[PDB]
Amino acid sequence: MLNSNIYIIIYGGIIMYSIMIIIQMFLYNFSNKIYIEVEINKYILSKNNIDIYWIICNCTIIIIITTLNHIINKIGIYNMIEYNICYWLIGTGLGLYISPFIVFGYKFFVYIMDLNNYSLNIYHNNNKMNDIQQIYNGTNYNDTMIFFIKDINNIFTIYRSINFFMNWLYQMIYYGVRMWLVFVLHSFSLGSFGELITVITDNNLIFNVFYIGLLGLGFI
Amino acid sequence: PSTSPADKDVPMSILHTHGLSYVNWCMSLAPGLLVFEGFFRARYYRSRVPPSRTV
Amino acid sequence: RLHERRLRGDVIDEWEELDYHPLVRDDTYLAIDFGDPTFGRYIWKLFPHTDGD
Amino acid sequence: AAPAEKPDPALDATKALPKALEEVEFFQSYAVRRKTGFHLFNRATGSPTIVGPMFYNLYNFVRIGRVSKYVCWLSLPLVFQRMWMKNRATGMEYDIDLENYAPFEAKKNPMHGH
Amino acid sequence: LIPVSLVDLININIIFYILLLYTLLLFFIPLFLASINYTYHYIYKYYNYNYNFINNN
Amino acid sequence: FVPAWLTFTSLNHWAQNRRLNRYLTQESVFGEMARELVRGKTADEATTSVMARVEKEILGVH
Amino acid sequence: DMMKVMPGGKAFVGTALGLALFGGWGVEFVKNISVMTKEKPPIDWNNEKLGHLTRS
Amino acid sequence: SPNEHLMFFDFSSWLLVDFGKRWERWVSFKKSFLTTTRSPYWSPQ
Amino acid sequence: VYTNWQSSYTRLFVSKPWMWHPLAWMTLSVGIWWKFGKESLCNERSFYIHTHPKWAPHKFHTVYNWSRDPIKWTLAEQYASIIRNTNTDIEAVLKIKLPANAN
Amino acid sequence: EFWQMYLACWPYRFRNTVVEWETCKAKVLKGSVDLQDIVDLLYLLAWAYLFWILGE
Amino acid sequence: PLPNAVVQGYTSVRGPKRPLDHFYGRTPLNIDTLWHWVKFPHRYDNLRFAVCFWAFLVSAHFANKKQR
Amino acid sequence: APLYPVLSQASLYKRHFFKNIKLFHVVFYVGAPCVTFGTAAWSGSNRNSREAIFMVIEERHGWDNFKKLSSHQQGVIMQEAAQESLLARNKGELHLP
Amino acid sequence: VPVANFRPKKPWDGPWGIQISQKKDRPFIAMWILFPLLLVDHLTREYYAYWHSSKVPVTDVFGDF
Ligand SMILES: CCCCCCCCCCCCCCCC(=O)OC[C@H](COP(=O)(O)O)OC(=O)CCCCCCCCCCCCCCC
Ligand SMILES: CCCCCCCCCCCCO[C@@H]1O[C@H](CO)[C@@H](O[C@H]2O[C@H](CO)[C@@H](O)[C@H](O)[C@H]2O)[C@H](O)[C@H]1O
Ligand SMILES: CCCCCCCCCCCCO[C@@H]1O[C@H](CO)[C@@H](O[C@H]2O[C@H](CO)[C@@H](O)[C@H](O)[C@H]2O)[C@H](O)[C@H]1O
Ligand SMILES: CCCCCCCCCCCCO[C@@H]1O[C@H](CO)[C@@H](O[C@H]2O[C@H](CO)[C@@H](O)[C@H](O)[C@H]2O)[C@H](O)[C@H]1O
Ligand SMILES: COCCOCCOCCOc1ccc(C(C)(C)CC(C)(C)C)cc1
Ligand SMILES: COCCOCCOCCOc1ccc(C(C)(C)CC(C)(C)C)cc1
Ligand SMILES: COCCOCCOCCOc1ccc(C(C)(C)CC(C)(C)C)cc1
Ligand SMILES: COCCOCCOCCOc1ccc(C(C)(C)CC(C)(C)C)cc1
């Protein structure tokens, strides 16, 4: 039929693996709480501290939990989840990205919409003509015949308001990609060296022996 | 509608497994659990000392 | 009255014991509602003889 | 702007390395062993090995486990399974026709895609 | 390599993982907040109003 | 807000009414579909009834 | 321009109004910079013959 | 293989969703809700 | 003593932005999939990219078997079920002759 | 020493087969079956299933 | 590497921890205190030998009959 | 005269078994069966050898014909395929891409 | 005359403390039931596609097919 628009999703093991990540949070009980307390009180002082703190704590502990589940509890998704880029961008990076905009979104929004009224910032602005320029003309700068290109100006000014919120996104993406590359490449390199060693020893059974030890190599 | 084909139903036997290497088994991190279970159990249950008499 | 039970060897839950401290039970429940599990500087400001302790 | 905060000792770093060394010392305390029944094959020079004298500690901790010391060995027969199957496969006789018609993971097979 | 894939960039399965995870988080927040601090015990025990009386004589 | 809300909603409602009235008097495929729906027919039945005409008159069925 | 800097959300109003009116055309203009130089085919102007159908 | 360890083959099935049919039924539910409630045009519903 | 912790989840959610954070996260992830991943991957017209070895390596645990084509026969069974539920004529599509937008 | 005790233990095992069987029958009929008995019977059934496969 | 607050577990003040309950007059019940109730199987070992023999034999009998 | 639903001693004794867990008591006790019977050691080896086995079979013999044979000859061909794949004569005896 | 700042409990005073404890230890109880269920979900699982598979398991969510 014509009206039938069909979509195919690929579904796997999600429910029981996501339940235990949360059930473990009662065991960990936010052991990272003191570190993030210290850092948040280093970096900001406001009434809305606890909010951002809680966010980071949740995010961080989940990461930690997954990492340990990726190291120890090896089943299904827990192995891939740190080797996947979607987890590192959307499962760790997006929450940390939107956390300050969810805690201090009022102030940031007001700031951003005020910066669209672009103007030169003067320290100790005891000037009088500055006020008349800012009110009558809208800006300190000369805005004569900029309406002629307003179609671009608006959108450009929008970027001009968020340009100083953009490196946060860049750093989030960069460090997510960094963690993904680190995990993937190191796992692959280690496994590759192991496989080469097994090829050397399988063809020479004088060496196909627990030559370092059953627990020594594993412990190391 | 929903389906459950017979292609997924195949024979199974542990005899046909290739297996693992000594290196891959060491990378499975079982030898680490083997030690650190006892390590953490010892730390927890040895932190709490009982009363005693010095002889 | 609760300590009478504790002396008999009875185990009292952490929250069952708090109900026998009702004025602290209320302020503790509100601190939970606010969601700030931190502590220590409030004691050091209200009781400055504990500062640094 | 000019708050004049005194130094907080909790923000210092004078306990992490001591605590880690305390943990490592607790680990190494379980390496203490009696002279009776002691044997360790040294190197040909006569000098000790690295992993050798740090097996007693690991197995003294395995002694204290409850579940791993009876489970984590059940993946070890699989190692010998591979050791045996690899040698079986090193010299297995196969049909030339099937190997030329259906080579396993060979390149440039259009039925695979490349 | 397998994890190098655009299919795994916007994988709906991991999005379901995140969804279920944080819905369960939200469900269990009121149990994470259920830790007791002993600060109001201290305030009750140690806050002592001045109990001295006034005596003009 | 109440006068503004009523103005907005009523103007858009009357705009949609005008749109339907204009479609019904339109000698086209969409006019026929709108007419068939205003009778009180189901969407699927009206789609089939109009496509039976589209295949014959418009597309020139084999 | 003088309403933009007023208080009471008028900065948001001015920005959103400029967007809704002209910033959409600006987005289209930016999209069209890499289209002016490109070889495009003739526009298949509608013959305005398909769609007419007598009522019944 | 190492790449075999970097793979997630814990899939269970393919969920097939006719978004056209689902959209049609959603619109039908909206119409039924607005008719049963006898809601006017100025309503937020 | 009244607390939204024990008596109202709604007022607790409203009073804590760190409870809004996961919900916004969820909404944003689903919007990302809707805008970018939905039509490019999950639609039937865009589902064969999972057979690509470069952009979807070993999505079937192996290289895709094109002689077998599981996608084709799965989806064909499903389309056949649709056709039987709708009672559409298979050969009715072949009787169509579309015109051209002349001139 | 182990060989001597392995030999000497065979009469004990063959004698206590019947004893353990009778006690199990009595506990199952009487219903006086406890946790340790259940665990021992599960271990028994596991080994029996293994030896069933082996006999197959 | 890490501040002293994270190591000692508190930023300013060390909070008291509620001690563990004991339940006087009975054994502790924990994940590690279960061997008091469940020892290794020791009651039906000789019956295990007998049943293993009979299981092997009966399985071999019916399997051989089926195969033949 | 407690006005609340006083909980018996035995009920607390039983709940203490559930809430007196430590982190390692979960981590290691659940990681040992998991690491042994998981995607690393046993389940992974089994389920990933099966893929190569049936690839080899369907390429060389066919899945339908394989289904028609006996369980014994099925296992024989499966073992031959497992050996062919473990060897990896075409990859230079290396399980890498 | 009674003592001040004291009253009987009310419905909006919430549950007692023992009830909050009973609420807290429910995850800890379900842990023992869910971790074995996790291991069973992984161990009793079968892959969904092979090189020979002409079909793949499909799950019509809303029965539209
Ligand atoms: C030639 C064959 C290999 C060599 C000879 C046979 C192996 C001999 C070694 C001993 C037997 C090994 C068994 C191998 C089975 C296998 O393949 O293991 C893999 C299989 C799954 O493989 P498939 O999914 O492919 O069928 O899983 C199982 O067998 C299920 C075992 C259940 C284990 C539960 C252990 C619980 C321990 C208590 C912990 C309590 C803590 C809480 C957690 C709930
Ligand atoms: C070395 C190179 C540079 C990198 C340095 C950073 C490495 C960080 C990784 C090691 C992390 C160890 O993390 C360790 O977690 C435990 C949780 O049990 C914390 O433990 C802390 O919290 C617990 C409760 O949660 C308190 O009861 C305890 O008193 C306190 O020590 C440790 O303070 C921290 O040190
Ligand atoms: C301070 C040290 C500085 C030097 C750094 C050296 C790099 C160390 C990298 C550690 C990270 C490697 O990460 C680790 O990779 C190995 C190898 O694949 C994975 O190991 C897993 O896959 C391999 C691949 O064959 C299997 O054989 C193995 O049985 C399984 O456990 C581990 O699950 C993962 O945790
Ligand atoms: C649990 C995770 C998933 C949660 C998903 C919830 C998403 C909710 C947002 C729904 C968005 C509504 O967005 C709406 O989508 C439908 C398809 O469904 C589009 O509909 C479009 O495509 C459909 C079929 O594909 C056509 O039949 C229809 O005529 C056309 O308009 C609408 O134009 C759009 O407005
Ligand atoms: C070079 O690396 C130096 C980094 O130092 C890391 C320091 O962190 C040490 C963390 O290890 C622990 C773990 C537990 C504990 C205690 C004993 C306090 C745990 C507790 C609260 C259960 C008793 C102390 C230290
Ligand atoms: C959580 O942090 C704990 C991690 O600590 C791990 C430490 O691992 C190193 C232990 O390995 C050794 C090394 C040396 C030794 C002994 C060989 C100290 C030297 C000896 C016995 C000859 C004096 C024993 C064990
Ligand atoms: C006295 O009774 C003791 C337990 O007896 C239980 C009998 O259970 C019947 C099991 O049936 C089978 C038969 C064969 C198999 C196969 C061939 C699949 C097992 C295999 C692959 C390990 C050889 C599995 C189960
Ligand atoms: C170099 O370091 C290697 C050691 O790392 C081993 C990783 O172990 C994983 C988690 O192990 C635990 C387990 C329990 C704990 C404690 C005992 C502190 C848990 C607690 C806080 C509940 C008592 C800490 C770490």
Author numbering:
A (entry chain f): 1 to 220
B (entry chain g): 2 to 56
C (entry chain h): 372 to 424
D (entry chain p): 7 to 120
E (entry chain l): 1 to 57
F (entry chain d): 126 to 187
G (entry chain k), J (entry chain M): 58 to 113
H (entry chain o): 14 to 58
What are the paper's exact sentences on this?
The membrane region was determined to 2.8 Å resolution, enabling the identification of a structurally divergent subunit a and visualisation of 37 associated native lipids. The membrane-bound Fo region is composed of 22 proteins, of which 13 have no homologs in animals and fungi. The well-resolved membrane region allowed the identification of 37 native lipids, leading to the assignment of 25 cardiolipins, whereas the 12 remaining phophoslipids could not be unambiguously identified and were modelled as phosphatidic acid. Importantly, cardiolipin binding sites are found at the rotor-stator interface, dimer interface, and in a peripheral Fo cavity. Our cryo-EM map allowed tracing of subunit a, for which we identified six structurally conserved membrane-embedded helices (H1a to H6a) directly from side-chain densities. By contrast, in the E. gracilis structure, the N-terminal part of H5a is kinked towards the lumen, and therefore does not interact with the c-ring, and instead extends towards the lumenal membrane surface. This structural rearrangement results in a smaller interface between subunits a and c, with only three c-subunits forming interactions, which also has implications for the formation of the matrix half-channel. At the exit of the lumenal half-channel, we identified a β-DDM detergent molecule, with its hydrophilic maltose head group protruding into the channel and the acyl chain extending between H5a and H6a, confirming both the hydrophilic environment and accessibility of the membrane-intrinsic lumen channel. Adjacent to the proton-half channels, the E. gracilis ATP synthase structure reveals two bound cardiolipins (CDL1, CDL2) flanking either side of the two horizontal helices H5a and H6a. Near the matrix half-channel, CDL2 is coordinated collectively by R160 of H5a, R50 of ATPEG6 and R22 of subunit k. Together, these two bound cardiolipins enclose the two horizontal membrane helices H5a and H6a, possibly acting to seal the Fo against proton leakage by recruiting a high density of acyl chains, as well as separating lipid and aqueous environments in the vicinity of the two half-channels.
